[PDB]
């Protein structure tokens, strides 16, 4: 199958409370497998998926040392950003970092990611060519010029193509079926009368993995995008996801409406009707 390893870092300055708080979470696809929190008791990387628990203490100790050095790096990034943005020393600020590798079935890099958000806004992102940067604003152009001059894209590219893919390969080997699985959605339609002239049809997808899914309503095969209420895909808490899509239907017209469900676990999309 197609797979990814991604790390999501959040650093938050707490002015007058010492070092910024550093949090990391690590994922294979939509499966969280590790966390690190600079505020936890005896900060150490911790397992959050069953198949990583087999890693020896040399794993947890090594990753702990890397996270501690990352936290200090992010502290310096936050200090530099304060200067670029002419910000005071009194305000709290956030750096979000995400990097990782997507591989196809051959297990070679398909797509590399390495990107940054400052105070909840795009800052700078490594472009899909892994050779060039997109800066969100004039401040981020300072970082872009520095990173271009220092040829850092070449090191990030070599990392994403090499080490990143090798760790992902090992984790897929550890995880086996727990990571290879595509759990198809359980689908059903419910009917919710509004008045005597109209009813909501709600098309549900439950218990699917991974999270990526498309739910659409059609009326005699014509897409109803503008008249569909679609909730954000939401976690069930058992490493499956949920979604629903709803459309308001005139009474007697229910059999014109079809719900269409596309998911990796379905060889072809499912078509459902109010039944």
């Amino acid at each position: 199958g197609s797979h990814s390893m991604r790390y999501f870092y959040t650093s938050v300055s707490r002015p007058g409370r010492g070092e910024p708080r550093f949090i990391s979470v690590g994922y294979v696809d939509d499966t969280q497998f590790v966390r690190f929190d600079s505020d936890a008791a005896s900060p150490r990387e911790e397992p959050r998926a069953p198949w990583i628990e087999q890693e020896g203490p040399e794993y947890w100790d090594r990753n702990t040392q890397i996270y501690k050095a990352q936290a200090q790096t992010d502290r310096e990034s936050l200090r530099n950003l304060r200067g670029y943005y002419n910000q005071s020393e009194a305000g709290s600020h956030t750096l979000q970092s995400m990097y990782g590798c997507d591989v196809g079935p051959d297990g070679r890099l398909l797509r590399g990611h390495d990107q940054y958000a400052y105070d909840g806004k795009d800052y700078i992102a490594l472009n899909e060519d892994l050779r060039s940067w997109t800066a969100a604003d004039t401040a981020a152009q300072i970082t872009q010029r520095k990173w271009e001059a220092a040829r850092e894209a070449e090191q990030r590219r070599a990392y994403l193509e090499g080490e990143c893919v090798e760790w992902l390969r090992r984790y897929l080997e550890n995880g086996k079926d727990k990571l290879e699985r595509a759990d198809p959605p359980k689908t059903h339609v419910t009917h919710h009368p509004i008045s005597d002239h109209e009813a909501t049809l709600r098309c549900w997808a439950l218990g699917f993995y991974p999270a990526e899914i498309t739910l659409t309503w059609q009326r005699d095969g014509e897409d109803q995008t503008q008249d569909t209420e679609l909730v954000e895909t939401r976690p069930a808490g058992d490493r499956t996801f949920q979604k629903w899509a709803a459309v308001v239907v005139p009474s007697g017209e229910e059999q014109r409406y079809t719900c269409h469900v596309q998911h990796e676990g379905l060889p072809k999309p499912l078509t459902l009707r109010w039944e």
Binding site: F36, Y59, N63, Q70, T73, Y99, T143
Partner: peptide, 9 residues
């Protein structure tokens, strides 16, 4: 595993 290369904005 987390990467051990570090970069400053």
């Amino acid at each position: 595993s987390p990467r051990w290369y570090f970069y400053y904005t």
